Design a protein around this ligand. Sequence first.
Ligand SMILES: Nc1ncnc2c1ncn2[C@@H]1O[C@H](CNS(=O)(=O)NC(=O)CCCC[C@@H]2SC[C@@H]3NC(=O)N[C@@H]32)C[C@H]1O
Length: 262
Amino acid sequence: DRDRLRPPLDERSLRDQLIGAGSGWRQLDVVAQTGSTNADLLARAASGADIDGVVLIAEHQTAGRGRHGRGWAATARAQIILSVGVRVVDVPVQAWGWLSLAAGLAVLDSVAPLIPPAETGLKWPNDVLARGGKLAGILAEVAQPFVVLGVGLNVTQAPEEVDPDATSLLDLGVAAPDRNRIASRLLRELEARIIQWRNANPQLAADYRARSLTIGSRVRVELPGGQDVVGIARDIDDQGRLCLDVGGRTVVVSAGDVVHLR
Ligand SMILES: Nc1ncnc2c1ncn2[C@@H]1O[C@H](CNS(=O)(=O)NC(=O)CCCC[C@@H]2SC[C@@H]3NC(=O)N[C@@H]32)C[C@H]1O
């Protein structure tokens, strides 16, 4: 079936392309299997390792982490599953939220040319959507002085294997997606967006708003704690928070699950 469309990654090739002069990535490893790539890089940092510019890719992930204590499902070689380490202590804590949004933007731009149906872009905070389905999910976790950015991108992953609301490049029409080429594109896009975030480049916010599916749409936001708030998304502030219009009132949300309404 789709197993024939899932060749292994080439670690040697990825290292040659992404490690060296002109690139900020210092280390890249491809593991056959792990519990969570995010947990692994957090564990390295917890033992005193400098994980800035360190890339960890897993062919398979058995205990993936989602946001708010949720999970992330995967089968072998069906996704691009990676985590990167980013030094953030040199940047004001108020702006750390934008690092998360920058990652989603990079993932989208890396695969966008391959895909162009309706509802294709970014859902606040870190959802890469295409044709209404979730193509990629991003998780950012703090381990001072670092932030670990995790990316789960469905390449050939069937929705029936992971989640009914999911989608993949293959299910979007991409017959033979090359994970080696896509992973390379993703990490080069990611490096650029991280640099932009670090230097507070205005283009980062401008580019995000251009790909936003949430801004200008009627939304139901499910807040931490179980409360729901219905309004219209208007903008993103300087902290990466979602600005909602609720009957003329402004409600700023730092975290929550967004559902685009009719
Ligand atoms: N395959 C999948 N593709 C679409 N959707 C899905 C899928 N596997 C479940 N789901 C569904 O999405 C839900 C998770 N939603 S979420 O709260 O916004 N969390 C996220 O999207 C962030 C996920 C980050 C995963 C990356 S991958 C490597 C790294 N390590 C790690 O443990 N996390 C990060 C749970 C499940 O209902």
